Amino acid sequence: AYFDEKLRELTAAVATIATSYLLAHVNQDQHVVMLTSCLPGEGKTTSSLNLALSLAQMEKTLLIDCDLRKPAIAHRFGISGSQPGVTNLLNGTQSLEDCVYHDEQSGLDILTAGVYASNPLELLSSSKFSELLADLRTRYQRIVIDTPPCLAVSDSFMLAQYVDSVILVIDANHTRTPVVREVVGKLTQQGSRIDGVILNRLN
Amino acid sequence: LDAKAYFDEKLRELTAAVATIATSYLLAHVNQDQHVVMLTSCLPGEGKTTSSLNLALSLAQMEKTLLIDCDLRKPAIAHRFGISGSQPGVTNLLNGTQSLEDCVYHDEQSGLDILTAGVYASNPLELLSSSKFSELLADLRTRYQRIVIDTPPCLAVSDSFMLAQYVDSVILVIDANHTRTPVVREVVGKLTQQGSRIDGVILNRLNA
Ligand SMILES: N[C@@H](Cc1ccc(OP(=O)(O)O)cc1)C(=O)O
Numbered sequence: 189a190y191f192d193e194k195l196r197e198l199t200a201a202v203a204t205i206a207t208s209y210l211l212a213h214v215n216q217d218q219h220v221v222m223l224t225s226c227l228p229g230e231g232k233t234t235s236s237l238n239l240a241l242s243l244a245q246m247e248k249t250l251l252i253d254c255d256l257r258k259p260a261i262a263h264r265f266g267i268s269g270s271q272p273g274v275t276n277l278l279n280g281t282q283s284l285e286d287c288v289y290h291d292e293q294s295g296l297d298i299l300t301a302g303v304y305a306s307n308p309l310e311l312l313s314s315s316k317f318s319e320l321l322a323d324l325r326t327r328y329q330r331i332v333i334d335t336p337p338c339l340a341v342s343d344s345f346m347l348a349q350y351v352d353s354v355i356l357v358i359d360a361n362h363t364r365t366p367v368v369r370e371v372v373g374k375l376t377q378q379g380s381r382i383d384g385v386i387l388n389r390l391n
Numbered sequence: 392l393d394a395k396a397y398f399d400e401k402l403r404e405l406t407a408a409v410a411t412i413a414t415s416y417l418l419a420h421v422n423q424d425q426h427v428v429m430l431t432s433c434l435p436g437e438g439k440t441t442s443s444l445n446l447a448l449s450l451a452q453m454e455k456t457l458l459i460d461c462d463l464r465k466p467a468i469a470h471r472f473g474i475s476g477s478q479p480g481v482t483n484l485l486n487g488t489q490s491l492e493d494c495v496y497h498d499e500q501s502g503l504d505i506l507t508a509g510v511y512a513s514n515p516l517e518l519l520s521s522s523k524f525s526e527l528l529a530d531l532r533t534r535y536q537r538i539v540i541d542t543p544p545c546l547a548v549s550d551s552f553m554l555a556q557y558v559d560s561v562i563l564v565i566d567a568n569h570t571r572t573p574v575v576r577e578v579v580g581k582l583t584q585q586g587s588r589i590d591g592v593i594l595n596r597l598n599a
Pocket residue numbers: 196197200228229230231232233234235260388389390
């Protein structure tokens with residue numbers, strides 16, 4: 189049943205235009221961009237690729253899958269589970285060349301989550317992670333980071349230290365605003381600021 | 392320089408797709424007797440082919456469906472599924488070069504069956520006014536639950552006024568941003584003053 193997949197993913201794409209516009213033409217200094225939600229199932233992963241796909245039109249961009257717990261990016265580009273990714277780099281198994289997947293339908297570069305890692309937050313709080321991000325900055329104009337939810341784990345409060353912009357994805361049909369207000373509060377009380385929302389509408 | 396071209400194809404495709412949902416619903420759940428349905432416009436450039444696509448694709452999820460390209464003059468269907476222009480289709484069948492089996496292309500991403508216009512033919516109205524064209528339609532009726540036919544614009548050539556005799560329903564595709572209603576009212580009259588009746592509109596909105 190293809191036509192409804194076409195409506196869902198086409199809709200998902202337009203729901204990210206104003207966010208993609210702002211980044212491309214207003215805050216051009218925001219080189220590393222982090223997408224997150226308060227809970228699972230709010231459209232965060234498809235908003236991430238859709239954002240990265242459009243930023244790929246004007247800049248050499250990288251999409252990184254950083255939900256090392258339930259990773260989806262590799263799934264949605266039809267990428268191998270074999271394909272080495274982010275954890276592979278941090279663990280020094282493979283190098284960046286044998287890790288980036290190039291979707292040259294689009295020009296986008298994709299760094300998948302990589303093989304399983306039982307220490308996801310340990311890995312992400314690494315100084316091998318901060319070093320990896322610093323190196324990717326000097327190689328890419330834009331980087332888009334898919335993160336796991338803000339209330340499930342602490343990963344994303346950890347990552348936000350490292351990024352230039354946080355975009356908060358919200359299933360406006362179901363997430364309640366007092367929750368959002370609390371998540372915004374938790375970020376504010378450690379430093380990070382929210383630079384924009386994406387309001388998906390799911391059923 | 393920017394992503395306007397990328398986002399505008401998506402927005403155009405999304406608007407085009409959404410414009411065919413109510414049409415498809417009506418056919419799937421209200422007018423189930425209308426097995427062969429014809430889409431057309433008054434002029435070129437009104438969204439008619441992608442409306443014929445999405446409609447067929449959408450009917451495919453509930454019924455065994457066939458999309459036929461019958462604009463033998465400026466054909467688009469084959470182009471939009473990434474099918475070779477070589478691929479035999481309607482003209483091939485009418486000219487008896489190929490038979491029906493190694494003519495139909497199956498899009499197995501979607502379940503839809505597609506019959507392209509086929510190789511070029513300089514006798515287009517000649518061919519469609521054939522009897523073996525009607526015999527081809529009679530056979531396709533017994534093989535498909537729905538048949539969706541993309542046809543030429545009404546005011547360019549007369550092909551579609553001829554085709555309407557063979558179909559159970561005519562759907563008129565309209566670029567409501569640009570087509571003017573007295574034009575539409577005139578084309579409706581031309582069908583009204585022969586057999587055909589219009590059973591529904593699809594209102595595209597385009598950005599020339
Ligand atoms: N693609 C659909 C639904 C969707 C659901 C979940 C999803 O992934 P996650 O919840 O992990 O962000 C992505 C997309 C939409 O955005 O409308």
